[model samples]
Target: IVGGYTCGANTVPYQVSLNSGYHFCGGSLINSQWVVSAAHCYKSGIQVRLGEDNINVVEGNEQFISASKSIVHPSYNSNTLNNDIMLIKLKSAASLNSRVASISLPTSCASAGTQCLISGWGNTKSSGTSYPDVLKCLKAPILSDSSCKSAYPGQITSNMFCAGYLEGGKDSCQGDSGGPVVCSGKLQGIVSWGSGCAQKNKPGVYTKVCNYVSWIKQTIASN
Candidate 1:
């Protein structure tokens, strides 16, 4: 819905819609019982829709699950939007099938210029109020930290990264926060913030997942 065409059902099996009363953000299943999302997406009464492509109607393959626990990164900075990631433990383990699967986390950092996929049901434009019924995907390329710094100034940090088109016309917008940024079939980043949707010289910012691998593992292990 943000800046590209609708994605096919089951194409991104791990994708999920986070509903805090309504569709507000996107998330990805990292395991049968755990989901990864943005810390800014934290809210009360959080629910998740899995194996779902459309939000208007429920399909037989779709499963609605309540979150038993929501864990925000301890170092998350709301002001800077740095370390802007979180994990949601499902009330029960998700039933895996072709339509419902988990995505693999990154093994290493994503290099500059790597092409990635960002899918969500966010607004079509930065100022738009409507959200899409079906999942939308955009092909965004990773920009170097230096290039990103030029556009964002002091906002870019080690815990964060940038991806999108410098020429504009493609990016994640409002309501697309907490969505997955998949690269090489692995979860590389989490949609965090941006200046605006599809704006020239301004790319979507994301939480670099690789930098928090240890934190993620430790949190999951202890919880």
Candidate 2:
């Protein structure tokens, strides 16, 4: 995450890193076995790394598990970047503890100006200099849909929203795609896309999870 702080050990129990031979995307533990991420982050043979601050270190608190099934939203459009949400079902359920747990999902959407947090293992610097060994996070408020549309100009859809500084400074970067955008302790968004990392007039776009609450619930229940 650009312009963010390192997370303390076990402080972000729900934060997870997706690996496909490398730390490619950040994810969230929404349940014991299901993980929420961006549809674009899905990779064959992807591994889910749960728990820990510094990923390079062998933290016993962390759990590394394989994905049993990966599901992307049916109407997800990669070209237009719509409905860019996904879920990963862990082969083995994660063990809930002080060091590892799940976050709650919001039934309703958050309003504009809602204080939100975004966590990731993405490049700390937009110039591609830094990608933290530990998880980094930023404080970005929920932006209005109309304002988001103004910034993106016919790009931001109902399934998407943005959260960051309008003047630029903070954002979720390259490797942070699929990370959580938590608002009031609920999983509100998923890092989807952006114009340029932390650049002026280009806020980081996210998959509005609120619009897909029913889909998520039904997918989990019916699966």
Candidate 3:
């Protein structure tokens, strides 16, 4: 389960599954109608599934909502994967309950060495083709920008950050893209890209959420 342990139901209420016909990526609910995800995960006919623990089961608490709109960052660079973030507007507002809620956005950047939580339905192994039905979670430590730069060379930009184990054996893989990286009970980053899953000295790269706070507010206000 994405190099992590099985999470209890409702442990991460804001976690959402982005299904493009089938499960493709993960996302986070920031508001009743707003979801934050990775821009690279965008595709046609995407739907949002909330209050879901097991993707295969049709739980009574699940809410399946179609996406009304998707807004990718204007400065998104696919080559270097810079500014790889996106916001999705649900066709209808999600009904909040014990199983479904929104996560709080970060007011400041995440500090190095801080432990954060990531949850998703990604593959358990890097080369695995199948993903887990139940959601999985992992506790990762944020790495210093300089250390992250060392792994990625000149690709590490100010808009991005890194998190995961330096020695390897734990990290988000395929299908975990667009998921949330929560630190101190706040949403700090969005899963963007990585060289490979759980690679030595190569942590998963993420889109720094705090840097786009103003942009998110502006876009939400205008839309």
Candidate 4:
């Protein structure tokens, strides 16, 4: 069932075998003690891959960080994906290295039309569940507030941000629910909801990092 997109040596996507190896997409590192991904990616057994590029085999410096705590936004809703954000608190603080450094959150949030980067191990196509062996990356432009509002209409709330190829072919799919959508060396969004995977006029939706800034800070402080 896992034969769609191929991978090279550099395809490590943040994933977890929550349902007995039923892998779901997630994010890489953003801090030593915390990993930012989607709320829905949470499972019982959580392990993260560091410096991995391929997926055919679990061939990386794998760090099996115990998810001691998970903080899903109080307002998050799986169906509407209103606040579809979460933070995975590792059992212990990770050792920071060149390959595993923390990414900073943007001090100043960006508006729409910003250029961003999205990486994942999700199905290249919409119909099947195929994850790449190597981490795959693509460039996406943030949508303008008006355009984003116009696109999703009532569904896009204040907590959501939009990014994708307007013409077509670059976006998040089924497995990429909780991955990072980075821009300007800062984390702007986390992969959330989208339509038709990588289809035209259906850009990838993300949980706006800016909106959850205070909550994230509070969660970190309390933990």
Candidate-wise lDDT, in order: 0.90, 0.90, 0.91, 0.68
Clashes of each: 0, 0, 0, 9
Deviation from truth (RMSD, Å), model 4: 3.4
Q: Candidate 2 vs candidate 4: which has greater TM-score?
A: 2
Q: Which residue runs does candidate 2 get wrong by more than 4 Å? A: none
Off by over 4 Å in 1: none
- Expressed as tens digits, the lDDT of each residue in 124-165 for candidate 3 is 896656688999999998999999999999899999999998
Off by over 4 Å in 3: none
List TM-score per model, in order. Answer: 0.97, 0.98, 0.97, 0.86
RMSD per model, one decimal:
1.0, 0.9, 1.0, 3.4
Kindly list the per-residue Cα lDDT of model 1 for residues 33-120, writing each as its tens digit.
Answer: 9999999999978998899888878767898999999999999999998889999999999999999999998889999999999999
Clashing residue pairs in candidate 1, if any?
Answer: none
User: What is the Å distance of residue 88 in model 2 from its true position?
Assistant: 0.3
| Sort order, lDDT high to low | 3, 2, 1, 4
Between candidates 1 and 3, the one scoring higher on lDDT is 3
